[PDB]
Design an enzyme around this catalytic site. Structure first.
Site, PDB file in Angstrom:
ATOM      1  CB  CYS A 140      51.351  34.594  42.024  1.00 34.29           C
ATOM      2  SG  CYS A 140      51.468  34.705  43.822  1.00 34.29           S
ATOM      3  CD  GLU A 174      50.872  29.535  47.373  1.00 36.88           C
ATOM      4  OE1 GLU A 174      51.956  29.491  46.726  1.00 36.88           O
ATOM      5  OE2 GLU A 174      50.631  30.325  48.296  1.00 36.88           O
TER       6      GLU A 174
HETATM    7  C1  LIG Z   1      47.219  30.492  42.077  1.00 42.77           C
HETATM    8  C2  LIG Z   1      46.891  31.776  41.756  1.00 42.77           C
HETATM    9  O1  LIG Z   1      47.778  32.657  41.296  1.00 42.77           O
HETATM   10  S1  LIG Z   1      45.343  32.364  41.891  1.00 42.77           S
HETATM   11  C3  LIG Z   1      45.367  33.976  41.112  1.00 42.77           C
HETATM   12  C4  LIG Z   1      45.214  34.003  39.591  1.00 42.77           C
HETATM   13  N1  LIG Z   1      45.436  35.394  39.166  1.00 42.77           N
HETATM   14  C5  LIG Z   1      44.707  36.493  39.359  1.00 42.77           C
HETATM   15  O2  LIG Z   1      43.675  36.451  40.021  1.00 42.77           O
HETATM   16  C6  LIG Z   1      45.233  37.834  38.806  1.00 42.77           C
HETATM   17  C7  LIG Z   1      44.193  38.580  37.959  1.00 42.77           C
HETATM   18  N2  LIG Z   1      43.663  37.651  36.935  1.00 42.77           N
HETATM   19  C8  LIG Z   1      44.390  37.235  35.961  1.00 42.77           C
HETATM   20  O3  LIG Z   1      45.637  37.709  35.859  1.00 42.77           O
HETATM   21  C9  LIG Z   1      43.819  36.248  34.967  1.00 42.77           C
HETATM   22  O4  LIG Z   1      42.425  36.588  34.914  1.00 42.77           O
HETATM   23  C10 LIG Z   1      44.097  34.677  34.976  1.00 42.77           C
HETATM   24  C11 LIG Z   1      45.626  34.914  34.840  1.00 42.77           C
HETATM   25  C12 LIG Z   1      43.450  34.519  36.351  1.00 42.77           C
HETATM   26  C13 LIG Z   1      43.255  34.592  33.666  1.00 42.77           C
HETATM   27  O5  LIG Z   1      44.016  35.172  32.598  1.00 42.77           O
HETATM   28  P1  LIG Z   1      43.553  35.423  31.062  1.00 42.77           P
HETATM   29  O6  LIG Z   1      44.648  35.851  30.156  1.00 42.77           O
HETATM   30  O7  LIG Z   1      42.377  36.342  31.177  1.00 42.77           O
HETATM   31  O8  LIG Z   1      43.128  33.897  30.661  1.00 42.77           O
HETATM   32  P2  LIG Z   1      42.564  33.265  29.292  1.00 42.77           P
HETATM   33  O9  LIG Z   1      42.165  34.276  28.242  1.00 42.77           O
HETATM   34  O10 LIG Z   1      43.500  32.186  28.956  1.00 42.77           O
HETATM   35  O11 LIG Z   1      41.145  32.657  29.759  1.00 42.77           O
HETATM   36  C14 LIG Z   1      40.903  31.596  30.706  1.00 42.77           C
HETATM   37  C15 LIG Z   1      39.409  31.346  31.023  1.00 42.77           C
HETATM   38  O12 LIG Z   1      38.893  32.233  32.044  1.00 42.77           O
HETATM   39  C16 LIG Z   1      37.702  32.871  31.555  1.00 42.77           C
HETATM   40  N3  LIG Z   1      37.620  34.268  31.977  1.00 42.77           N
HETATM   41  C17 LIG Z   1      38.672  35.098  32.034  1.00 42.77           C
HETATM   42  N4  LIG Z   1      38.230  36.301  32.428  1.00 42.77           N
HETATM   43  C18 LIG Z   1      36.884  36.198  32.607  1.00 42.77           C
HETATM   44  C19 LIG Z   1      35.823  37.144  33.016  1.00 42.77           C
HETATM   45  N5  LIG Z   1      36.191  38.414  33.302  1.00 42.77           N
HETATM   46  N6  LIG Z   1      34.521  36.701  33.078  1.00 42.77           N
HETATM   47  C20 LIG Z   1      34.198  35.426  32.769  1.00 42.77           C
HETATM   48  N7  LIG Z   1      35.155  34.559  32.387  1.00 42.77           N
HETATM   49  C21 LIG Z   1      36.486  34.912  32.309  1.00 42.77           C
HETATM   50  C22 LIG Z   1      37.870  32.933  30.050  1.00 42.77           C
HETATM   51  O13 LIG Z   1      36.654  33.207  29.293  1.00 42.77           O
HETATM   52  C23 LIG Z   1      38.501  31.579  29.815  1.00 42.77           C
HETATM   53  O14 LIG Z   1      37.452  30.622  29.819  1.00 42.77           O
HETATM   54  P3  LIG Z   1      37.140  29.857  28.423  1.00 42.77           P
HETATM   55  O15 LIG Z   1      38.331  28.975  28.178  1.00 42.77           O
HETATM   56  O16 LIG Z   1      35.876  29.099  28.796  1.00 42.77           O
HETATM   57  O17 LIG Z   1      37.071  30.977  27.373  1.00 42.77           O
END
Ligand SMILES: CC(=O)SCCNC(=O)CCNC(=O)[C@H](O)C(C)(C)COP(=O)(O)OP(=O)(O)OC[C@H]1O[C@@H](n2cnc3c(N)ncnc32)[C@H](O)[C@@H]1OP(=O)(O)O
Ligand SMILES: [Cl-]
Ligand SMILES: [Zn+2]
Length: 258
Positions: A140, A174
Protein backbone atom coordinates in the site's frame (compact mmCIF):
# COMPACT_ATOMS: atom_id res chain seq x y z
CA UNK A 1 -20.98 6.18 13.88
CA UNK A 2 -18.00 5.18 11.71
CA UNK A 3 -14.96 7.45 12.06
CA UNK A 4 -15.49 10.24 9.56
CA UNK A 5 -12.94 12.84 10.57
CA UNK A 6 -9.55 12.78 12.30
CA UNK A 7 -7.55 15.46 13.95
CA UNK A 8 -3.78 14.76 13.64
CA UNK A 9 -1.16 17.40 14.34
CA UNK A 10 -3.04 20.53 13.48
CA UNK A 11 -4.89 19.12 10.43
CA UNK A 12 -8.34 17.73 10.41
CA UNK A 13 -9.05 15.24 7.56
CA UNK A 14 -12.39 13.75 6.44
CA UNK A 15 -12.42 9.95 5.83
CA UNK A 16 -12.77 8.45 2.39
CA UNK A 17 -13.50 4.96 3.57
CA UNK A 18 -14.53 2.79 6.51
CA UNK A 19 -11.72 1.87 8.88
CA UNK A 20 -12.39 -0.73 11.62
CA UNK A 21 -11.28 1.32 14.67
CA UNK A 22 -13.00 -0.13 17.77
CA UNK A 23 -16.68 0.90 17.76
CA UNK A 24 -16.68 3.36 20.70
CA UNK A 25 -13.90 5.15 18.74
CA UNK A 26 -16.74 5.88 16.31
CA UNK A 27 -17.09 8.78 18.79
CA UNK A 28 -18.16 11.31 16.31
CA UNK A 29 -15.41 10.56 15.72
CA UNK A 30 -13.58 13.03 15.64
CA UNK A 31 -10.71 10.69 16.34
CA UNK A 32 -7.66 12.52 17.66
CA UNK A 33 -4.32 10.99 16.65
CA UNK A 34 -0.91 11.77 18.05
CA UNK A 35 1.06 12.74 14.94
CA UNK A 36 4.23 11.12 16.27
CA UNK A 37 3.22 7.89 17.88
CA UNK A 38 -0.15 7.69 16.01
CA UNK A 39 -2.02 6.75 19.15
CA UNK A 40 -5.77 7.20 18.65
CA UNK A 41 -7.91 8.93 21.28
CA UNK A 42 -11.59 9.78 21.73
CA UNK A 43 -11.62 13.28 23.20
CA UNK A 44 -9.83 16.59 22.84
CA UNK A 45 -9.03 16.36 26.61
CA UNK A 46 -7.30 12.95 26.42
CA UNK A 47 -5.68 14.29 23.19
CA UNK A 48 -4.34 17.40 24.90
CA UNK A 49 -3.10 15.36 27.93
CA UNK A 50 -1.28 12.97 25.65
CA UNK A 51 0.36 15.73 23.61
CA UNK A 52 1.90 17.20 26.80
CA UNK A 53 3.06 13.77 27.91
CA UNK A 54 4.17 11.90 24.74
CA UNK A 55 7.87 12.12 24.19
CA UNK A 56 8.01 10.75 20.61
CA UNK A 57 9.01 13.38 17.99
CA UNK A 58 9.48 11.14 14.99
CA UNK A 59 8.70 7.65 13.76
CA UNK A 60 10.30 4.54 15.37
CA UNK A 61 12.86 2.46 13.46
CA UNK A 62 15.94 3.51 11.58
CA UNK A 63 16.21 6.74 9.60
CA UNK A 64 17.49 5.22 6.30
CA UNK A 65 17.06 8.46 4.33
CA UNK A 66 17.65 12.12 5.04
CA UNK A 67 18.06 15.03 2.53
CA UNK A 68 17.25 18.52 3.63
CA UNK A 69 14.18 18.09 5.88
CA UNK A 70 12.88 15.02 4.08
CA UNK A 71 13.38 11.70 5.79
CA UNK A 72 12.28 8.10 5.61
CA UNK A 73 12.07 5.80 8.64
CA UNK A 74 12.14 2.03 8.07
CA UNK A 75 9.82 0.30 10.57
CA UNK A 76 9.54 -3.51 10.84
CA UNK A 77 5.97 -4.36 11.82
CA UNK A 78 7.17 -7.34 13.92
CA UNK A 79 9.20 -4.91 16.08
CA UNK A 80 6.81 -1.95 16.35
CA UNK A 81 3.51 -3.73 16.24
CA UNK A 82 1.30 -1.13 17.93
CA UNK A 83 2.65 1.80 15.90
CA UNK A 84 2.23 -0.20 12.71
CA UNK A 85 -1.32 -1.25 13.70
CA UNK A 86 -2.14 2.46 14.39
CA UNK A 87 -0.74 3.39 10.97
CA UNK A 88 -2.77 0.74 9.15
CA UNK A 89 -5.99 2.01 10.78
CA UNK A 90 -5.11 5.54 9.74
CA UNK A 91 -4.30 4.41 6.13
CA UNK A 92 -7.49 2.39 5.76
CA UNK A 93 -9.40 5.70 6.06
CA UNK A 94 -8.07 6.53 2.59
CA UNK A 95 -7.79 3.04 1.04
CA UNK A 96 -10.63 1.26 -0.35
CA UNK A 97 -9.32 -2.12 0.81
CA UNK A 98 -6.41 -3.30 3.02
CA UNK A 99 -5.18 -6.50 4.73
CA UNK A 100 -6.28 -6.87 8.44
CA UNK A 101 -4.94 -3.98 10.41
CA UNK A 102 -3.55 -6.04 13.30
CA UNK A 103 -1.51 -8.36 11.06
CA UNK A 104 1.49 -6.05 10.51
CA UNK A 105 4.26 -8.53 11.22
CA UNK A 106 4.53 -9.72 7.56
CA UNK A 107 5.28 -6.09 6.46
CA UNK A 108 7.94 -3.40 6.72
CA UNK A 109 6.70 0.17 6.59
CA UNK A 110 8.62 3.11 5.14
CA UNK A 111 7.45 6.35 6.74
CA UNK A 112 8.04 9.61 4.96
CA UNK A 113 8.24 12.79 7.12
CA UNK A 114 8.98 16.51 6.80
CA UNK A 115 11.29 17.71 9.53
CA UNK A 116 11.22 21.05 11.36
CA UNK A 117 12.21 22.44 14.82
CA UNK A 118 9.19 20.67 16.45
CA UNK A 119 9.85 17.18 15.07
CA UNK A 120 9.33 14.89 12.08
CA UNK A 121 5.78 15.22 10.69
CA UNK A 122 4.33 12.25 8.90
CA UNK A 123 3.55 12.91 5.25
CA UNK A 124 2.75 9.43 3.94
CA UNK A 125 4.26 5.93 3.80
CA UNK A 126 4.43 2.77 1.82
CA UNK A 127 4.33 -0.76 3.09
CA UNK A 128 6.12 -3.83 1.64
CA UNK A 129 5.59 -7.55 2.33
CA UNK A 130 8.81 -9.13 3.58
CA UNK A 131 7.85 -12.03 1.26
CA UNK A 132 5.58 -11.31 -1.71
CA UNK A 133 4.12 -14.38 -3.49
CA UNK A 134 3.43 -12.03 -6.47
CA UNK A 135 6.72 -10.06 -6.58
CA UNK A 136 5.12 -6.87 -5.24
CA UNK A 137 7.54 -4.19 -4.11
CA UNK A 138 4.83 -2.06 -2.57
CA UNK A 139 1.72 -3.37 -0.79
CA UNK A 140 0.00 0.00 0.00
CA UNK A 141 1.16 3.55 -0.69
CA UNK A 142 -0.46 6.77 0.72
CA UNK A 143 0.22 10.52 0.91
CA UNK A 144 -2.14 12.01 3.52
CA UNK A 145 -4.70 14.27 1.79
CA UNK A 146 -3.29 17.64 2.96
CA UNK A 147 0.08 16.81 1.34
CA UNK A 148 -1.28 15.35 -1.90
CA UNK A 149 -0.36 16.65 -5.43
CA UNK A 150 3.06 17.88 -4.36
CA UNK A 151 5.31 15.08 -5.51
CA UNK A 152 5.32 13.04 -2.28
CA UNK A 153 3.53 10.05 -3.89
CA UNK A 154 6.04 9.91 -6.76
CA UNK A 155 8.88 10.23 -4.27
CA UNK A 156 7.64 7.12 -2.38
CA UNK A 157 7.14 5.20 -5.66
CA UNK A 158 10.76 6.12 -6.70
CA UNK A 159 12.01 5.08 -3.22
CA UNK A 160 10.29 1.71 -3.54
CA UNK A 161 12.14 1.20 -6.85
CA UNK A 162 15.43 2.26 -5.25
CA UNK A 163 14.95 -0.55 -2.74
CA UNK A 164 14.23 -2.98 -5.63
CA UNK A 165 17.38 -1.97 -7.51
CA UNK A 166 19.55 -2.46 -4.39
CA UNK A 167 17.97 -5.94 -4.07
CA UNK A 168 18.78 -6.59 -7.75
CA UNK A 169 15.18 -7.27 -8.44
CA UNK A 170 12.24 -6.09 -10.55
CA UNK A 171 9.02 -5.32 -8.67
CA UNK A 172 5.53 -4.02 -9.19
CA UNK A 173 2.90 -2.53 -6.86
CA UNK A 174 0.22 -4.81 -5.53
CA UNK A 175 -3.01 -5.00 -7.69
CA UNK A 176 -5.66 -3.45 -7.83
CA UNK A 177 -4.25 0.10 -8.17
CA UNK A 178 -6.69 2.74 -7.17
CA UNK A 179 -7.46 5.36 -9.89
CA UNK A 180 -4.99 7.69 -8.13
CA UNK A 181 -2.42 4.90 -7.87
CA UNK A 182 -2.84 4.36 -11.64
CA UNK A 183 -2.18 8.07 -12.46
CA UNK A 184 0.86 8.23 -10.09
CA UNK A 185 2.51 5.06 -11.31
CA UNK A 186 1.85 5.87 -15.00
CA UNK A 187 3.32 9.28 -14.42
CA UNK A 188 6.44 8.04 -12.59
CA UNK A 189 7.00 5.13 -15.02
CA UNK A 190 6.77 7.51 -18.10
CA UNK A 191 9.19 10.05 -16.64
CA UNK A 192 11.72 7.39 -15.71
CA UNK A 193 11.48 5.55 -19.05
CA UNK A 194 11.66 8.89 -20.97
CA UNK A 195 14.64 10.27 -18.93
CA UNK A 196 16.39 6.92 -19.58
CA UNK A 197 15.76 6.71 -23.34
CA UNK A 198 16.80 10.20 -24.45
CA UNK A 199 16.14 -2.80 -25.10
CA UNK A 200 12.97 -3.39 -22.95
CA UNK A 201 14.89 -6.11 -21.04
CA UNK A 202 17.57 -3.46 -20.47
CA UNK A 203 15.15 -0.82 -19.36
CA UNK A 204 13.87 -3.44 -16.88
CA UNK A 205 17.38 -4.25 -15.55
CA UNK A 206 18.14 -0.55 -15.19
CA UNK A 207 15.01 0.66 -13.38
CA UNK A 208 13.60 -2.44 -11.60
CA UNK A 209 10.26 -1.73 -13.39
CA UNK A 210 8.70 -4.93 -14.78
CA UNK A 211 8.70 -5.63 -18.51
CA UNK A 212 4.89 -5.68 -18.33
CA UNK A 213 4.82 -2.18 -16.75
CA UNK A 214 7.43 -0.97 -19.21
CA UNK A 215 5.35 -2.29 -22.14
CA UNK A 216 2.10 -0.65 -21.05
CA UNK A 217 3.84 2.64 -20.42
CA UNK A 218 5.62 2.63 -23.78
CA UNK A 219 2.33 1.82 -25.57
CA UNK A 220 0.68 4.88 -23.91
CA UNK A 221 3.67 6.96 -25.10
CA UNK A 222 3.24 5.39 -28.57
CA UNK A 223 6.87 4.06 -28.38
CA UNK A 224 6.32 0.41 -29.04
CA UNK A 225 5.62 -1.63 -32.19
CA UNK A 226 4.76 -5.28 -33.03
CA UNK A 227 6.86 -7.53 -35.08
CA UNK A 228 5.32 -10.97 -35.36
CA UNK A 229 3.49 -10.25 -32.06
CA UNK A 230 6.73 -9.36 -30.18
CA UNK A 231 7.02 -5.91 -28.46
CA UNK A 232 9.77 -3.75 -29.87
CA UNK A 233 10.89 -0.38 -28.56
CA UNK A 234 10.28 2.18 -31.29
CA UNK A 235 11.50 5.67 -30.53
CA UNK A 236 13.43 8.69 -31.75
CA UNK A 237 15.34 11.14 -29.52
CA UNK A 238 12.86 13.48 -31.34
CA UNK A 239 10.37 12.85 -28.57
CA UNK A 240 11.18 11.56 -25.86
CA UNK A 241 8.95 14.50 -25.39
CA UNK A 242 9.04 16.35 -22.08
CA UNK A 243 6.68 19.33 -22.28
CA UNK A 244 3.80 20.01 -19.81
CA UNK A 245 10.25 15.79 -10.86
CA UNK A 246 9.60 18.07 -7.84
CA UNK A 247 11.33 15.76 -5.30
CA UNK A 248 13.58 12.82 -6.14
CA UNK A 249 15.46 10.09 -4.36
CA UNK A 250 19.16 10.86 -4.01
CA UNK A 251 20.87 7.42 -3.80
CA UNK A 252 23.74 9.13 -1.91
CA UNK A 253 21.36 10.02 0.95
CA UNK A 254 20.05 6.50 1.19
CA UNK A 255 21.53 4.17 3.81
CA UNK A 256 20.16 0.70 3.21
CA UNK A 257 21.31 -2.77 2.14
CA UNK A 258 19.25 -5.79 0.89
C1 LIG B 1 -0.84 -0.31 -4.59
C2 LIG B 1 -1.61 0.64 -3.99
O1 LIG B 1 -1.38 1.09 -2.76
S1 LIG B 1 -2.91 1.35 -4.75
C3 LIG B 1 -3.41 2.70 -3.68
C4 LIG B 1 -2.65 4.01 -3.82
N1 LIG B 1 -3.11 4.89 -2.74
C5 LIG B 1 -4.29 5.49 -2.54
O2 LIG B 1 -5.22 5.30 -3.32
C6 LIG B 1 -4.48 6.34 -1.27
C7 LIG B 1 -5.03 7.75 -1.58
N2 LIG B 1 -4.19 8.37 -2.62
C8 LIG B 1 -2.97 8.72 -2.39
O3 LIG B 1 -2.50 8.56 -1.15
C9 LIG B 1 -2.13 9.30 -3.50
O4 LIG B 1 -3.09 10.00 -4.32
C10 LIG B 1 -1.04 8.50 -4.35
C11 LIG B 1 -0.25 8.16 -3.05
C12 LIG B 1 -2.09 7.54 -4.89
C13 LIG B 1 -0.71 9.84 -5.07
O5 LIG B 1 -0.02 10.70 -4.15
P1 LIG B 1 0.44 12.24 -4.38
O6 LIG B 1 1.32 12.77 -3.30
O7 LIG B 1 -0.83 12.98 -4.63
O8 LIG B 1 1.35 12.04 -5.72
P2 LIG B 1 2.19 13.09 -6.61
O9 LIG B 1 1.96 14.54 -6.26
O10 LIG B 1 3.56 12.55 -6.64
O11 LIG B 1 1.49 12.95 -8.05
C14 LIG B 1 1.45 11.79 -8.91
C15 LIG B 1 0.58 11.96 -10.18
O12 LIG B 1 -0.82 11.71 -9.94
C16 LIG B 1 -1.59 12.82 -10.42
N3 LIG B 1 -2.71 13.12 -9.53
C17 LIG B 1 -2.65 13.06 -8.19
N4 LIG B 1 -3.85 13.43 -7.71
C18 LIG B 1 -4.64 13.73 -8.77
C19 LIG B 1 -6.04 14.20 -8.92
N5 LIG B 1 -6.76 14.39 -7.79
N6 LIG B 1 -6.54 14.42 -10.18
C20 LIG B 1 -5.78 14.23 -11.28
N7 LIG B 1 -4.51 13.81 -11.16
C21 LIG B 1 -3.93 13.55 -9.94
C22 LIG B 1 -0.67 14.02 -10.30
O13 LIG B 1 -1.09 15.21 -11.04
C23 LIG B 1 0.63 13.39 -10.74
O14 LIG B 1 0.61 13.34 -12.16
P3 LIG B 1 1.69 14.26 -12.94
O15 LIG B 1 3.03 13.64 -12.65
O16 LIG B 1 1.22 14.08 -14.38
O17 LIG B 1 1.58 15.64 -12.28
CL1 LIG C 1 -10.20 16.82 4.24
ZN1 LIG D 1 2.09 10.03 21.14
Amino acid sequence: KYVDKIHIGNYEIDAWYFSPFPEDYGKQPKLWLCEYCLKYMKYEKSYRFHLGQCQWRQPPGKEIYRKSNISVHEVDGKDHKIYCQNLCLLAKLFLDHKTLYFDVEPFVFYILTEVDRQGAHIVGYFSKEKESPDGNNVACILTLPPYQRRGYGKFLIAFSYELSKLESTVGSPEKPLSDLGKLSYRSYWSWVLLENLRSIKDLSQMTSITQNDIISTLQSLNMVKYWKGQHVICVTPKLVEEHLPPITVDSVCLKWAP
